[PDB]
Symmetry: D2
Subunit: 296 residues, 4 copies
């Protein structure tokens, strides 16, 4: 036998950082969960009990905290790039660092219509994420995403004209509920290293904001033919707005809301145009995925 | 042996309802999870296999949907009261109905600064809940709550002057992080029946909004001596603002954010006044509870 | 305003303990999650910012670990009783201690048919729990439970003869699936204090084993008329077998498995006697509860 | 813009099947969760609102149930292969089917030492899984796995001789707790189609049983130098025992159990040889991964 692939490190490292403006009193907080996995000349830790090649996972955890102390933690694309670059530069035998960051929302509270200097609310479980792959001699591959953005529209969704055969029971509809949890990922052009990531820093927050705005406005305004057709419109608009993105990927559940026929009970009309009360379905769910890139 | 207590019914009944203004095109959505448990002369279903006394749980589920079709689902205090009253009135041998409702957030989207007529976002996992106990001959007992309201303040929290003995290691602090998930419950005066609940309908949404506003403003502005002292201030303000509330209860975790001593590493200063990077603790957590009522 | 009730402490305290027989090499592990909440003359921590009456939650956490070091952690009824008694005896102004323990399974591995001396498997998420209320001058109230015991039987469950009216759609059945997650609680006679709990120590493990055995054998062998009728049989048998139990409570979901009519597809027969493939329903679920005590 | 990748289908399809031996009365149950995602000439559903190329996700769900009615659901490698083959054969324009199956445990109950004919227990949340990729013209790629197998050993784990630099605080240890949740995957040789999968049917259950037995025995008996070194031993043994496996992958968290220094309290000794009480850590966790194949 031989090791064909290996990576190891620390997962689920919770990190908070505060910035304090001593002049204004305004404080700003950042909270994330971090995973760092390393690759390199480590096969003998697996095959020969050679721990000399292991940077302990506990040490990786200490390094995450030290890196957060000494560097900006925002945008997360930069933090990830700094952290991954640290490992491949510090350790000769470490050749790749895989950094995953989940950013948790801490939105400043408005109290009596004024932003509060040091109080925050978790206004949803929506996340901003990065996957940063720092590979010695191959640069830095960044995927940026938003996830857990839960939305519903009560009309202006349709689904008709699909294939009908002996496996088909679904009725065509010209007016349904559409609800999803948005997972949207944009894949950056390969960066040569940390300097090139630093040169694009303003683009990270701006592209996240664009992706979010395009997703919400497209969902709200598209008279949707299908999840497929609506998600493609979001992806093509994000690509048009950031030339430094190669691809946009959506992964969208179709969280079904079923009509309830109540006609058995006193002739109550609760279907088609009279549909008022629905049964949200926990499972199963449609799952629709696309990766969109630029045409030849 | 004998049955000392019994209740049975349907849990985890997901319900959506849409209101459509045909004149403006504006649609409004409501989504909840409902549990209805019945009590009454049902002991023989347990002791004698006598199913004649059972209103099937499936029938209870149908009744929830039919009730939502025929009645307002808001405020949830009213919906619960209607649903519970239905069971004790319809079935001679059913003497109590216990209705628990969790309301899920569907906040109207603003698109290009204008409220969208039929698109919604789940802006957090914060819930609005009710527990409605409809008891034949004893009226309607309502507890209203907000839950899952996750907040953090980065300063203006203290914890000193607590008991110190041979079990104590905790350092006194004059400046810490305070973060919690707010569970706040207000217990209404007993209502004689559904008519009295209907007579107070406007008070339900207003008291929820007051409870939420008092919680946020008190959390943000109190230079907190303890979770205990801050939560008591919230409870006393809500009681002062709604005479139809008998008690206010808070249940608050103290979600600890620990300082990280980095002085072992190149003399980095990250404690006390220099504390910037913290380790959020998933467990354990403080848990602080109060029920506040009006003084003799 | 005034404090009507208050309790505070530490929740989600994870504890592991190992016993090592130095003579045989056999090691035995115990793992739990502990919550301790205290009550007493603590209202001024809430009303006056008086932290002098607070035994810090951090100190409560230290005390749990110290208590586990100095005392047996099994049976959990004893551990809870020791821990709660410690707080009301040590602190004059603490008058009650509420101790909740969840015990996690670590079952010794059999390797090549021989019990391994120091290797363990989590053979399910079933828990053994206690709720121990130690109240100064009123003794020790213990509820013992098993929870998360997930079972299914594929026949020998029925449900017919229930009430049928204009809300009823459910078909009577003489052969269905029954599946549940068992939550069973036995309430002990009040104990005068820790000495009386110690005097009954062997009864705790034996009564848990009896409750589990009665639940499994009754579920497997009862040709069930209803969840109600089967759970009552379990409760009455446990009461008959331990005179030191006052009540037995079950809380049982009816985790529905729905037939799937496939007759629309090539006349496939998959209902009634031909039912082979079913759709397990995640929600809603029946919820059936009983408390059984001894007859007058 | 253009579609670079697309797949869509139904996720979280819960399926139960019962086998009834009419001669012995013995019933056997199977329960799974299924996801089927299709690929093919479907880009115009995304780009042109052309639903004619969509096999509705609802139809995919019906097909899963119909396939379970007409075919064995065990081993899951076979079921997945049948289901995926159905889609690429039935629909000319569908060129790949991605089938993921999670199998839930329903272990026959022993009542008074005899196997019960129709009663079952969920004896843990451990899963048996498959990922079956059926690709028109490229055959069937199967990954088989076990997951959620939670184990702990109380000694005979070590971790010393790792890299020590200015980021390192971890103490070397010659005797620690090791606990993990096992995720083990074996990748089969490519199969040409469904006939070749059928020709290997007995190997699927046998290889799962081998993987499980090797994992447990290796964990229990290895005096472990590291997670890395122990997992490699498991992988090399599974490869040696099934020539039809190309690779074995483990993904293992190191679920840390920390010593608790109690020496501040009455000089209690609870570290090193005297360590009895530990604090299980929920996060962070080490995460160790290997893919092992056969040497050149
Ligand atoms: O938007 C949709 N896409 C699909 O592919 C589909 N299948 N069923 N319903 C559906 N809705
Ligand atoms: O606000 C607090 N209350 C307490 O009771 C406590 N105990 N430790 N820390 C604490 N913080
Ligand atoms: O066992 C059952 N009890 C009930 O009360 C019930 N209601 N629907 N199905 C049921 N099954
Ligand atoms: O088994 C281990 N492997 C590692 O890579 C490691 N790092 N810290 N502790 C560890 N334990
Ligand atoms: Kr952070
Ligand atoms: Kr969408
Ligand atoms: Kr963008
Ligand atoms: Kr609703
Ligand atoms: Kr608070
Ligand atoms: Kr209020
Ligand atoms: Kr323990
Ligand atoms: Kr039961
Ligand atoms: Kr018992
Ligand atoms: Kr199945
Ligand atoms: Kr391991
Ligand atoms: Kr194997
Ligand atoms: Na390197
Ligand atoms: Na009645
Ligand atoms: Na006392
Ligand atoms: Na095809």
């Amino acid at each position: 036998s031989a090791v064909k692939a290996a990576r190891y490190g620390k997962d689920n490292v919770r990190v908070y950082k505060v910035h304090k403006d001593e002049k204004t009193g305004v404080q700003t907080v950042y909270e994330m969960t971090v995973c760092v996995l390393l690759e390199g000349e480590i096969e003998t830790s697996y095959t020969k009990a050679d721990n000399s090649v292991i940077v302990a996972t506990d040490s990786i955890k200490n390094t995450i905290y030290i890196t957060a102390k000494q560097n900006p933690v925002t945008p997360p694309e930069l933090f990830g790039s700094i952290l991954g670059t640290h490992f491949i530069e510090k350790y000769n035998h470490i050749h790749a660092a895989h950094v995953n960051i989940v950013c948790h929302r801490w939105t400043r509270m408005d109290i009596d219509g004024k932003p509060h200097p040091h109080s925050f609310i978790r206004d949803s479980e929506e996340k901003r994420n990065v996957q940063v792959d720092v590979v010695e001699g191959k640069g830095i591959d960044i995927k940026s995403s938003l996830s857990g953005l839960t939305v519903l529209k009560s009309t202006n969704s349709q689904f008709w004209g699909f294939l009908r055969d002996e496996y088909t029971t679904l009725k065509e509809t010209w007016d349904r509920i559409l609800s999803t949890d948005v997972d949207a990922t944009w894949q950056w052009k390969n960066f040569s290293g940390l300097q090139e990531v630093r040169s694009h820093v303003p683009k990270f927050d701006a592209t996240w904001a664009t992706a979010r705005e395009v997703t919400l406005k497209t969902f709200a305004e598209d008279n949707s033919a299908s999840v497929q057709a609506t998600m493609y419109k979001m992806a093509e608009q994000i690509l048009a707005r950031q030339q430094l993105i190669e691809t946009v990927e959506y992964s969208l559940p179709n969280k079904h809301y079923f009509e309830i026929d109540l006609s058995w009970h006193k002739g109550l009309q609760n279907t088609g145009k009279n549909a008022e009360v629905f049964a949200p379905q926990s499972d199963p769910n449609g799952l629709i995925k696309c990766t969109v890139g630029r045409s030849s």
